[PDB]
């Protein structure tokens, strides 16, 4: 239909478009590299290649697909690997025995031929149906019940509903009548990669994410269907925190969409998806591959794919949230995504605003990060899901005033700022307890009250102790520990106890692999109770003794409790919640006995 | 004492609801009376509709 | 009046014209009478509008 | 009597801009409506116009535009706005579409946004006082009617929560001294969660009659975020001068407004200004702030309290420095106080108001207000110094007065600084609380307090 005029890397001009649609996908050249329009100039158009562009020719045909970028939504997406162009990588590797990905390969996102069982939800002929009505369910695998739903822009009366049976994707199962037309339907539905899926209503979040890490779960809680921000450091986080979301998270599904990353890390993690099963179900061991989907685009991938992959991932997440399942989206991108925006702006010759980043970076980041929340779905029956976003930014070593970082912290409510010093200190969680913050605190008030009313005050006390330690660290560095008082001494002891027992979670050991909230709250309660008892003891300071003398005494006389407070970390959660609660209650009772007999002896 | 005050507050809320309903009825009556001016406003519009000339 | 105003505002040599199928005949009667009015309104050669 | 001309000469679509080919005499900022080929309706604003060629920036993005099948209807009106008394008690989108599930407003009159500036002769000095509710601002750095005070803050500090608290607890001091008060709350680029927080706060406010809430989400188009302060200040000007009502305007996270200005300036393909931000930001923020004042002719006045986020947790950033140069106050949000978990993280020592003397008086506020303000400020500085001294010397070498200053600082942080998010204190009550803090010092120790005023209240 049209022919190329100008080729410069990802940018390819195609004269002869005349009537063409903004962001309409167009195939370029004999190999048919799929690309989207970015800049109309008249009859001419500008197309990002989305592939390797070497070897084009002037007058090579360019065809219009007339449709914007879309990803095939349907049964069979779970446990699959897709590029930003929604290409099943394992399917490509199997169909074509060559280890490479051939240039301009055209493979359907989901195999039509593959069979799947069906289960209508007592649907009757002639019933009026609306978009998003969960008329039937399909078990893609154990513990995964894909409830097929009507497309959002679809409604009518059910003239025909298929009986339950084995069907391929190309097969039609549902027929609707509306306004005197008949509309057939297959399981697979297409949805634009932009323009988020419609939502009946947005709801205020109520439940925390309850991640394995202690600091993430207590100091900086995050609600279900809420934004997150991590600096994407190595060693931990994108390896540790990500593993915690993958197997230790209460989210039903994980959509890992890493883009612009180290290739070997994704090779390893893809080798890890089939393995590393988690026995979350009572009677079965849920292999994480069932509850994950990898959108993998390594650094060698084309630049436009770096922009496309994020929207593909968020579209998949919105799809899953439509069924009511709570799904988490971890994104190792948005670090290199800004670089991709810089590149496309530079080729398009747009004028950058700050440090070479195009201005609409902030707007696009705001859109993507606001595409997540707790949502009441469309159709019947009434159901509710959520999407939780965890997106990386520049590594913590660089300045946190970087435009991408500044844009993210504007909209993101929870920043889990990792510390380079902590990483060098080999402190594995590496979460800084000063820069990090979770604005979601006020919402979780009811949850914390119903769980444990005393938790709020002890958390505030722990925060105050940490702040005091950080504040007077400068003083003790300058002046010295000689002037430190008994209150300062117990404050430093409690701060060290926190830094060692509480904020540190190795996660490579069964006792530290996962820390349930009940164990975390008890450990914090024990630490705060010990701090309070020490405060009261040094405050009493009577009987020709006490204060710093009392502090030294309780350091030596009550050294056993202080030592086993550290071992409280080693208490194995697998032993069972009632046993751990009993053990911690006994420890608390002994701590109360401590500083009470020490009170009786009056030093 | 709180139960007595709460009964009084519930009665006050009901009375306020009734007063608001009465005020809304009065406002609806005034708006309906405005239809008299609306009838002439229609032909005023028609006049300013056809002011288009040349 | 409407034709004359539209011709004045649009101010181009040749135009098209779309009106309801009914009353097209009296529209035709209005046509040319307006064209002359337009040509007289401003010192321009009368347009091609033969709509 | 004039009808729109529906052009269909879309030639060239570049980024967030669409270019028309042959437009007969376009206006510069004539608002313009675009019908997609699919029939979707999207609005836009006409940018710089050349000879018969006009470039248009459209809202809701440029997706779906085709050169052949998109038509552009020219309204020819420069972004008028309907404004009326009944606009109160309703929530409006960034452009102004009612989102409160209510009827569209019936216009009393159509007003031009970015209204023409006040003749400086008509300006008058700030007078009276207004209860922010938060005792720290009410006492340390008070705000009077007609004074523009920004509130510097950083990401992660509860700037928005404090703004909502101010919205709830705002009221004239003159009531205590013995309904013209109104708030135009414009929120620019707020997140979805904060949007729900504001919506719920308005639903259970109990003060809807005196509050109007302009809301512009992050997902909203950037140009809408630009125009939101304009329409907000226009409505405030109508409700204040044309309606004789004291008006308190709160603008939250104007850094988003500055970013949107940067975006549109880049769209113009103009060279970026110094330090990245556009050069015209000074004039823009001046136009935004300077609309606040007291008109001699009209009894109503305007108070401006922008909530400007300071990037990188400092005021060295171009926007905080620029707004500090333009405005006449600086209240601060200390990161440590939030870290130490004091719900009002107000940094009292950095806090200051240039016109504090004018706000405090005998007729408005109590006579001892300024005296206790100065005394508390000096005593708090002394308490911080004595805390450092106790740290360095071990607290044994301290005298009795040093311990007095220490306990005063502790009680101050425990009671005066920390306020319930829903707890409301009249300025008289705040002064009483400050006095109760003051009784712990001896009478002679309150050096700053004038004589015959100390004995007036220190007696208790």
PDB file of N, CA, C and O in Angstrom, chain A residues 406-454:
ATOM      1  N   UNK A 406      12.204  11.681  40.849  1.00  0.00           N
ATOM      2  CA  UNK A 406      11.332  12.758  41.299  1.00  0.00           C
ATOM      3  C   UNK A 406       9.905  12.551  40.816  1.00  0.00           C
ATOM      4  O   UNK A 406       8.949  12.767  41.569  1.00  0.00           O
ATOM      5  N   UNK A 407       9.741  12.135  39.560  1.00  0.00           N
ATOM      6  CA  UNK A 407       8.406  11.881  39.033  1.00  0.00           C
ATOM      7  C   UNK A 407       7.730  10.748  39.789  1.00  0.00           C
ATOM      8  O   UNK A 407       6.546  10.835  40.133  1.00  0.00           O
ATOM      9  N   UNK A 408       8.468   9.671  40.058  1.00  0.00           N
ATOM     10  CA  UNK A 408       7.872   8.533  40.747  1.00  0.00           C
ATOM     11  C   UNK A 408       7.440   8.903  42.160  1.00  0.00           C
ATOM     12  O   UNK A 408       6.301   8.630  42.557  1.00  0.00           O
ATOM     13  N   UNK A 409       8.321   9.548  42.928  1.00  0.00           N
ATOM     14  CA  UNK A 409       7.980   9.875  44.312  1.00  0.00           C
ATOM     15  C   UNK A 409       6.840  10.880  44.393  1.00  0.00           C
ATOM     16  O   UNK A 409       6.246  11.068  45.461  1.00  0.00           O
ATOM     17  N   UNK A 410       6.518  11.540  43.282  1.00  0.00           N
ATOM     18  CA  UNK A 410       5.373  12.443  43.277  1.00  0.00           C
ATOM     19  C   UNK A 410       4.063  11.670  43.373  1.00  0.00           C
ATOM     20  O   UNK A 410       3.127  12.097  44.058  1.00  0.00           O
ATOM     21  N   UNK A 411       3.979  10.526  42.692  1.00  0.00           N
ATOM     22  CA  UNK A 411       2.709   9.815  42.589  1.00  0.00           C
ATOM     23  C   UNK A 411       2.710   8.559  43.453  1.00  0.00           C
ATOM     24  O   UNK A 411       1.683   8.193  44.035  1.00  0.00           O
ATOM     25  N   UNK A 412       3.850   7.874  43.542  1.00  0.00           N
ATOM     26  CA  UNK A 412       3.928   6.653  44.332  1.00  0.00           C
ATOM     27  C   UNK A 412       3.729   6.985  45.803  1.00  0.00           C
ATOM     28  O   UNK A 412       4.207   8.014  46.298  1.00  0.00           O
ATOM     29  N   UNK A 413       3.013   6.114  46.513  1.00  0.00           N
ATOM     30  CA  UNK A 413       2.725   6.338  47.921  1.00  0.00           C
ATOM     31  C   UNK A 413       3.691   5.632  48.858  1.00  0.00           C
ATOM     32  O   UNK A 413       3.766   6.002  50.034  1.00  0.00           O
ATOM     33  N   UNK A 414       4.420   4.629  48.379  1.00  0.00           N
ATOM     34  CA  UNK A 414       5.322   3.849  49.214  1.00  0.00           C
ATOM     35  C   UNK A 414       6.662   3.750  48.505  1.00  0.00           C
ATOM     36  O   UNK A 414       6.740   3.221  47.391  1.00  0.00           O
ATOM     37  N   UNK A 415       7.714   4.239  49.152  1.00  0.00           N
ATOM     38  CA  UNK A 415       9.069   4.176  48.618  1.00  0.00           C
ATOM     39  C   UNK A 415       9.898   3.317  49.561  1.00  0.00           C
ATOM     40  O   UNK A 415      10.098   3.682  50.723  1.00  0.00           O
ATOM     41  N   UNK A 416      10.368   2.174  49.067  1.00  0.00           N
ATOM     42  CA  UNK A 416      11.209   1.277  49.859  1.00  0.00           C
ATOM     43  C   UNK A 416      12.676   1.527  49.519  1.00  0.00           C
ATOM     44  O   UNK A 416      13.389   0.674  48.990  1.00  0.00           O
ATOM     45  N   UNK A 417      13.119   2.739  49.842  1.00  0.00           N
ATOM     46  CA  UNK A 417      14.461   3.168  49.506  1.00  0.00           C
ATOM     47  C   UNK A 417      15.551   2.302  50.100  1.00  0.00           C
ATOM     48  O   UNK A 417      15.774   2.314  51.314  1.00  0.00           O
ATOM     49  N   UNK A 418      16.232   1.542  49.252  1.00  0.00           N
ATOM     50  CA  UNK A 418      17.367   0.741  49.680  1.00  0.00           C
ATOM     51  C   UNK A 418      18.593   1.630  49.853  1.00  0.00           C
ATOM     52  O   UNK A 418      18.712   2.685  49.226  1.00  0.00           O
ATOM     53  N   UNK A 419      19.501   1.197  50.722  1.00  0.00           N
ATOM     54  CA  UNK A 419      20.681   1.973  51.074  1.00  0.00           C
ATOM     55  C   UNK A 419      21.927   1.285  50.538  1.00  0.00           C
ATOM     56  O   UNK A 419      22.120   0.084  50.751  1.00  0.00           O
ATOM     57  N   UNK A 420      22.767   2.052  49.841  1.00  0.00           N
ATOM     58  CA  UNK A 420      24.040   1.516  49.373  1.00  0.00           C
ATOM     59  C   UNK A 420      24.942   1.150  50.543  1.00  0.00           C
ATOM     60  O   UNK A 420      25.642   0.131  50.503  1.00  0.00           O
ATOM     61  N   UNK A 421      24.948   1.978  51.590  1.00  0.00           N
ATOM     62  CA  UNK A 421      25.749   1.671  52.771  1.00  0.00           C
ATOM     63  C   UNK A 421      25.293   0.373  53.422  1.00  0.00           C
ATOM     64  O   UNK A 421      26.120  -0.451  53.829  1.00  0.00           O
ATOM     65  N   UNK A 422      23.977   0.172  53.530  1.00  0.00           N
ATOM     66  CA  UNK A 422      23.462  -1.074  54.088  1.00  0.00           C
ATOM     67  C   UNK A 422      23.865  -2.267  53.233  1.00  0.00           C
ATOM     68  O   UNK A 422      24.212  -3.330  53.762  1.00  0.00           O
ATOM     69  N   UNK A 423      23.810  -2.116  51.908  1.00  0.00           N
ATOM     70  CA  UNK A 423      24.241  -3.193  51.026  1.00  0.00           C
ATOM     71  C   UNK A 423      25.714  -3.515  51.239  1.00  0.00           C
ATOM     72  O   UNK A 423      26.100  -4.688  51.308  1.00  0.00           O
ATOM     73  N   UNK A 424      26.552  -2.483  51.350  1.00  0.00           N
ATOM     74  CA  UNK A 424      27.960  -2.708  51.659  1.00  0.00           C
ATOM     75  C   UNK A 424      28.127  -3.266  53.065  1.00  0.00           C
ATOM     76  O   UNK A 424      29.052  -4.041  53.331  1.00  0.00           O
ATOM     77  N   UNK A 425      27.232  -2.886  53.982  1.00  0.00           N
ATOM     78  CA  UNK A 425      27.263  -3.452  55.326  1.00  0.00           C
ATOM     79  C   UNK A 425      26.770  -4.893  55.335  1.00  0.00           C
ATOM     80  O   UNK A 425      26.678  -5.509  56.403  1.00  0.00           O
ATOM     81  N   UNK A 426      26.425  -5.432  54.163  1.00  0.00           N
ATOM     82  CA  UNK A 426      25.957  -6.804  54.001  1.00  0.00           C
ATOM     83  C   UNK A 426      24.626  -7.020  54.709  1.00  0.00           C
ATOM     84  O   UNK A 426      24.192  -8.163  54.891  1.00  0.00           O
ATOM     85  N   UNK A 427      23.972  -5.935  55.112  1.00  0.00           N
ATOM     86  CA  UNK A 427      22.631  -6.031  55.668  1.00  0.00           C
ATOM     87  C   UNK A 427      21.661  -6.363  54.541  1.00  0.00           C
ATOM     88  O   UNK A 427      21.318  -5.493  53.733  1.00  0.00           O
ATOM     89  N   UNK A 428      21.227  -7.627  54.488  1.00  0.00           N
ATOM     90  CA  UNK A 428      20.562  -8.128  53.286  1.00  0.00           C
ATOM     91  C   UNK A 428      19.275  -7.385  52.948  1.00  0.00           C
ATOM     92  O   UNK A 428      19.095  -7.023  51.773  1.00  0.00           O
ATOM     93  N   UNK A 429      18.345  -7.137  53.881  1.00  0.00           N
ATOM     94  CA  UNK A 429      17.147  -6.372  53.494  1.00  0.00           C
ATOM     95  C   UNK A 429      17.472  -4.996  52.943  1.00  0.00           C
ATOM     96  O   UNK A 429      16.771  -4.511  52.046  1.00  0.00           O
ATOM     97  N   UNK A 430      18.516  -4.351  53.460  1.00  0.00           N
ATOM     98  CA  UNK A 430      19.089  -3.115  52.934  1.00  0.00           C
ATOM     99  C   UNK A 430      18.096  -1.962  52.867  1.00  0.00           C
ATOM    100  O   UNK A 430      18.398  -0.933  52.251  1.00  0.00           O
ATOM    101  N   UNK A 431      16.920  -2.096  53.477  1.00  0.00           N
ATOM    102  CA  UNK A 431      15.933  -1.027  53.433  1.00  0.00           C
ATOM    103  C   UNK A 431      16.327   0.063  54.418  1.00  0.00           C
ATOM    104  O   UNK A 431      16.496  -0.193  55.617  1.00  0.00           O
ATOM    105  N   UNK A 432      16.475   1.286  53.920  1.00  0.00           N
ATOM    106  CA  UNK A 432      16.721   2.410  54.808  1.00  0.00           C
ATOM    107  C   UNK A 432      15.449   2.757  55.569  1.00  0.00           C
ATOM    108  O   UNK A 432      14.367   2.859  54.986  1.00  0.00           O
ATOM    109  N   UNK A 433      15.581   2.933  56.878  1.00  0.00           N
ATOM    110  CA  UNK A 433      14.441   3.251  57.724  1.00  0.00           C
ATOM    111  C   UNK A 433      14.282   4.744  57.964  1.00  0.00           C
ATOM    112  O   UNK A 433      13.575   5.136  58.896  1.00  0.00           O
ATOM    113  N   UNK A 434      14.928   5.582  57.157  1.00  0.00           N
ATOM    114  CA  UNK A 434      14.804   7.027  57.270  1.00  0.00           C
ATOM    115  C   UNK A 434      14.230   7.665  56.015  1.00  0.00           C
ATOM    116  O   UNK A 434      13.289   8.459  56.098  1.00  0.00           O
ATOM    117  N   UNK A 435      14.779   7.338  54.845  1.00  0.00           N
ATOM    118  CA  UNK A 435      14.256   7.899  53.605  1.00  0.00           C
ATOM    119  C   UNK A 435      12.944   7.227  53.219  1.00  0.00           C
ATOM    120  O   UNK A 435      12.044   7.865  52.662  1.00  0.00           O
ATOM    121  N   UNK A 436      12.815   5.933  53.501  1.00  0.00           N
ATOM    122  CA  UNK A 436      11.627   5.194  53.103  1.00  0.00           C
ATOM    123  C   UNK A 436      10.401   5.690  53.858  1.00  0.00           C
ATOM    124  O   UNK A 436      10.495   6.193  54.980  1.00  0.00           O
ATOM    125  N   UNK A 437       9.240   5.548  53.225  1.00  0.00           N
ATOM    126  CA  UNK A 437       7.982   5.991  53.804  1.00  0.00           C
ATOM    127  C   UNK A 437       6.824   5.297  53.107  1.00  0.00           C
ATOM    128  O   UNK A 437       6.920   4.916  51.938  1.00  0.00           O
ATOM    129  N   UNK A 438       5.722   5.142  53.838  1.00  0.00           N
ATOM    130  CA  UNK A 438       4.509   4.528  53.314  1.00  0.00           C
ATOM    131  C   UNK A 438       3.324   5.406  53.675  1.00  0.00           C
ATOM    132  O   UNK A 438       2.863   5.389  54.821  1.00  0.00           O
ATOM    133  N   UNK A 439       2.823   6.158  52.699  1.00  0.00           N
ATOM    134  CA  UNK A 439       1.710   7.072  52.917  1.00  0.00           C
ATOM    135  C   UNK A 439       0.396   6.353  53.190  1.00  0.00           C
ATOM    136  O   UNK A 439      -0.573   6.998  53.603  1.00  0.00           O
ATOM    137  N   UNK A 440       0.340   5.043  52.983  1.00  0.00           N
ATOM    138  CA  UNK A 440      -0.875   4.266  53.178  1.00  0.00           C
ATOM    139  C   UNK A 440      -1.190   4.011  54.645  1.00  0.00           C
ATOM    140  O   UNK A 440      -2.101   3.230  54.936  1.00  0.00           O
ATOM    141  N   UNK A 441      -0.464   4.645  55.567  1.00  0.00           N
ATOM    142  CA  UNK A 441      -0.571   4.286  56.979  1.00  0.00           C
ATOM    143  C   UNK A 441      -1.972   4.523  57.524  1.00  0.00           C
ATOM    144  O   UNK A 441      -2.490   3.706  58.294  1.00  0.00           O
ATOM    145  N   UNK A 442      -2.603   5.634  57.145  1.00  0.00           N
ATOM    146  CA  UNK A 442      -3.882   5.998  57.746  1.00  0.00           C
ATOM    147  C   UNK A 442      -4.980   5.009  57.366  1.00  0.00           C
ATOM    148  O   UNK A 442      -5.897   4.751  58.154  1.00  0.00           O
ATOM    149  N   UNK A 443      -4.908   4.449  56.156  1.00  0.00           N
ATOM    150  CA  UNK A 443      -5.937   3.513  55.720  1.00  0.00           C
ATOM    151  C   UNK A 443      -5.936   2.243  56.559  1.00  0.00           C
ATOM    152  O   UNK A 443      -7.003   1.753  56.944  1.00  0.00           O
ATOM    153  N   UNK A 444      -4.757   1.708  56.863  1.00  0.00           N
ATOM    154  CA  UNK A 444      -4.625   0.442  57.572  1.00  0.00           C
ATOM    155  C   UNK A 444      -4.912   0.557  59.064  1.00  0.00           C
ATOM    156  O   UNK A 444      -4.635  -0.393  59.808  1.00  0.00           O
ATOM    157  N   UNK A 445      -5.439   1.697  59.515  1.00  0.00           N
ATOM    158  CA  UNK A 445      -5.715   1.874  60.937  1.00  0.00           C
ATOM    159  C   UNK A 445      -6.730   0.855  61.435  1.00  0.00           C
ATOM    160  O   UNK A 445      -6.539   0.245  62.493  1.00  0.00           O
ATOM    161  N   UNK A 446      -7.815   0.657  60.686  1.00  0.00           N
ATOM    162  CA  UNK A 446      -8.838  -0.300  61.094  1.00  0.00           C
ATOM    163  C   UNK A 446      -8.281  -1.716  61.122  1.00  0.00           C
ATOM    164  O   UNK A 446      -8.572  -2.499  62.036  1.00  0.00           O
ATOM    165  N   UNK A 447      -7.477  -2.066  60.116  1.00  0.00           N
ATOM    166  CA  UNK A 447      -6.882  -3.397  60.069  1.00  0.00           C
ATOM    167  C   UNK A 447      -5.990  -3.639  61.276  1.00  0.00           C
ATOM    168  O   UNK A 447      -6.078  -4.681  61.935  1.00  0.00           O
ATOM    169  N   UNK A 448      -5.115  -2.680  61.581  1.00  0.00           N
ATOM    170  CA  UNK A 448      -4.228  -2.844  62.726  1.00  0.00           C
ATOM    171  C   UNK A 448      -5.012  -2.892  64.030  1.00  0.00           C
ATOM    172  O   UNK A 448      -4.672  -3.663  64.936  1.00  0.00           O
ATOM    173  N   UNK A 449      -6.065  -2.081  64.146  1.00  0.00           N
ATOM    174  CA  UNK A 449      -6.874  -2.088  65.361  1.00  0.00           C
ATOM    175  C   UNK A 449      -7.536  -3.442  65.571  1.00  0.00           C
ATOM    176  O   UNK A 449      -7.497  -4.001  66.672  1.00  0.00           O
ATOM    177  N   UNK A 450      -8.147  -3.990  64.519  1.00  0.00           N
ATOM    178  CA  UNK A 450      -8.815  -5.278  64.661  1.00  0.00           C
ATOM    179  C   UNK A 450      -7.806  -6.397  64.887  1.00  0.00           C
ATOM    180  O   UNK A 450      -8.106  -7.383  65.572  1.00  0.00           O
ATOM    181  N   UNK A 451      -6.604  -6.269  64.323  1.00  0.00           N
ATOM    182  CA  UNK A 451      -5.581  -7.287  64.536  1.00  0.00           C
ATOM    183  C   UNK A 451      -4.972  -7.168  65.928  1.00  0.00           C
ATOM    184  O   UNK A 451      -5.056  -8.095  66.741  1.00  0.00           O
ATOM    185  N   UNK A 452      -4.351  -6.031  66.219  1.00  0.00           N
ATOM    186  CA  UNK A 452      -3.723  -5.809  67.515  1.00  0.00           C
ATOM    187  C   UNK A 452      -3.695  -4.318  67.821  1.00  0.00           C
ATOM    188  O   UNK A 452      -2.905  -3.577  67.223  1.00  0.00           O
ATOM    189  N   UNK A 453      -4.543  -3.842  68.735  1.00  0.00           N
ATOM    190  CA  UNK A 453      -4.600  -2.393  68.993  1.00  0.00           C
ATOM    191  C   UNK A 453      -3.288  -1.809  69.485  1.00  0.00           C
ATOM    192  O   UNK A 453      -2.971  -0.654  69.171  1.00  0.00           O
ATOM    193  N   UNK A 454      -2.509  -2.575  70.247  1.00  0.00           N
ATOM    194  CA  UNK A 454      -1.268  -2.054  70.804  1.00  0.00           C
ATOM    195  C   UNK A 454      -0.167  -1.919  69.761  1.00  0.00           C
ATOM    196  O   UNK A 454       0.874  -1.322  70.054  1.00  0.00           O
TER     197      UNK A 454
END
